[PDB]
Each structure stands twice: as C-alpha cells, then as structure tokens.
C-alpha cells in the first residue's frame, strides 16, 4: 500500500486512510 494508493485499497464510508512512516492504515 501507499499514500497515493491508499484510497483504492481501503474503501468504505467512515474509514479514513493515514500514512505513518510509509505505512498506510485506514481507521476513521
């Protein structure tokens, strides 16, 4: 995953993606 490829991976409704040291992660 990546910062420019996060939205594609994690996609829901109340799940916002985040970038931490090149580590993408979606929470809220």
How many Cα atoms sit within 13 Å of 15 on the Cβ side? 11
Q: Are 19 and 6 in contact (CB under 8 A)?
A: yes
Distance CA 6, CA 23 (A): 10
Angle at 20 between CA 3 and CA 16, to 5 degrees: 60
* Chain CA centroid to CA 20, Å: 10
Domain count, the chain: 1
Q: Evaluate the CA torsion angle 8, 10, 14, 17 in order and state its sign.
A: negative
Q: What share of the chain is helix, strand, coil (3-state, %, to 5)?
A: 15, 30, 55
Query: What is the residue range of 6's domain?
Result: 1-28
């Amino acid at each position: 995953v990546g910062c420019e490829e996060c939205p594609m991976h994690c996609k829901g409704k109340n799940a916002k993606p985040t970038c931490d040291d090149g580590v993408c992660n979606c929470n809220v």
